[PDB]
Design a protein around this ligand. Structure first.
Ligand SMILES: Nc1ncnc2c1ncn2[C@@H]1O[C@H](COP(=O)(O)OP(=O)(O)OP(=O)(O)O)[C@@H](O)[C@H]1O
Ligand SMILES: [Mg+2]
Ligand SMILES: [Mg+2]
Ligand SMILES: [Zn+2]
Length: 344
DNA sequence: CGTCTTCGGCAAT
DNA sequence: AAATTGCCGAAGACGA
């Protein structure tokens, strides 16, 4: 019901007064931590990269969770793939970060220790409190707003071989745009699989795609070309959020995150490259495409990382089969009854 | 649809 | 020498 879905999206609209107060609190704390980190020899070339739903304009309910990425431009990087995970690597150099070296590989553990320590020493100074390595630190500002701070290495090199067949946007955002996007740097965040591994990150490309998302260059720039891509992502994020809360006493949905929904959404955009396939009048049909695709990923236990096709976010090593069947069962029930979790 | 606010980039310090 | 910063304009809440 497109009429009901529009009512849900109004409920999910952020308060501009809340945005102004929340952004002010986040920026003040983030700018403070950047100034301190820029004073350290190791974090000398640190820079800010705003990531996540808020800066992608797909945050729902309230601006209570922010995601920032503190990126270091590292030089002469040499990646070594860990096992055959296609997404986790060991970092080597072909310098400031010499202190974090353990042998010849860059220690994500050591680098995370100084990162957390410098931030923790600076957070006790401030009405903010600090709480698998990525995000490095989670701040709670005034008991209302949480900010995930992710340490990240910036490599301006060509993307690793595992991403060769990823970012399949040629028939959607154009091969010209895929060439320019893959020219931008890629990022490595400390994530353990072994605690000295780094995981590939493309949150900057995800933000850029979401804010320049149409086949048409003028998509969502005027009233005539308002698509419902972001509305469908919001509805999918809310559906998973309401289900995880409804079944929080059970532990099945604890492994599911909004990134699974966001990754699945990018795949639906590849499957439906035209803006006419995302017309505002067809919000219920477009949302059902996102639901139908997400059910297919659950049932087949296959949800490829949008940038690393061989990395399966729904792998059996990552999520239990009973968790996928449970979420499959609940989504099918929810769809067959006009999504009761939206009313709550 | 005009107004106001925030965010992102990068010449110019 | 290279990190900082002010500013322009899009995105989107908001109302009338
Ligand atoms: N498993 C993952 N693999 C790769 N990148 C991830 C993963 N989880 C999160 N990210 C990156 O971190 C960012 C923030 O993720 P987070 O878990 O905070 O949710 P989100 O995308 O911000 O949406 P919301 O916070 O509203 O649920 C994402 O935009 C994504 O780019
Ligand atoms: Mg977020
Ligand atoms: Mg997070
Ligand atoms: Zn659009």
């Amino acid at each position: 019901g497109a009429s009901k879905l529009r009512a849900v999206l109004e409920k999910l609209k952020l308060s501009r007064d809340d945005i102004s107060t929340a952004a002010g609190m986040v920026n003040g704390v983030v700018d403070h931590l950047l100034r301190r980190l820029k004073c350290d020899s190791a974090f000398r070339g640190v820079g800010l990269l705003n990531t996540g739903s808020y800066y992608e304009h797909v945050k729902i309910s309230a601006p209570n969770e922010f995601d920032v990425m503190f990126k270091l431009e590292v030089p002469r990087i040499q990646l070594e793939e860990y096992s055959n995970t296609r997404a986790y690597y060991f970092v080597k150099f072909k310098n400031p970060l010499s202190q974090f070296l353990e042998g010849e590989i860059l220690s994500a553990s050591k680098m995370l220790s100084k990162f957390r320590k410098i931030i923790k020493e600076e957070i006790n100074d401030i009405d903010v409190i600090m709480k698998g390595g990525s995000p490095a630190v989670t701040l709670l500002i005034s008991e209302k707003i949480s900010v995930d701070i992710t340490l990240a290495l910036e490599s301006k090199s060509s993307w690793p071989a595992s991403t060769q067949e990823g970012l399949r946007i040629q028939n959607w955002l154009s091969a010209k745009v895929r060439k320019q996007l893959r020219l931008k740097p890629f990022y490595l965040v400390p994530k353990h699989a072994q605690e000295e591994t780094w995981r590939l990150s493309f949150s900057h490309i995800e933000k850029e795609i979401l804010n320049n998302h149409g086949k048409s260059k003028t998509c969502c720039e005027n009233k005539e070309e308002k698509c419902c891509r972001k509305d469908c992502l919001k509805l999918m994020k809310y559906l998973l959020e309401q289900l995880k809360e409804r079944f929080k006493d059970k532990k099945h949905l604890d492994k599911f995150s909004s990134y699974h929904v966001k990754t699945a959404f990018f795949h639906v955009c590849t499957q439906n490259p035209q803006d006419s396939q995302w017309d505002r009048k067809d919000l219920g049909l477009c949302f059902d495409n996102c639901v139908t695709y997400f059910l297919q990923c659950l049932r087949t236990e296959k949800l490829e990382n949008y940038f690393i096709p061989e990395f399966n976010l729904f792998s059996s090593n990552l999520i239990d089969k009973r968790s996928k069947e449970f979420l499959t069962k609940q989504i099918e029930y929810e769809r067959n009854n006009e999504f009761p979790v939206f009313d709550e």
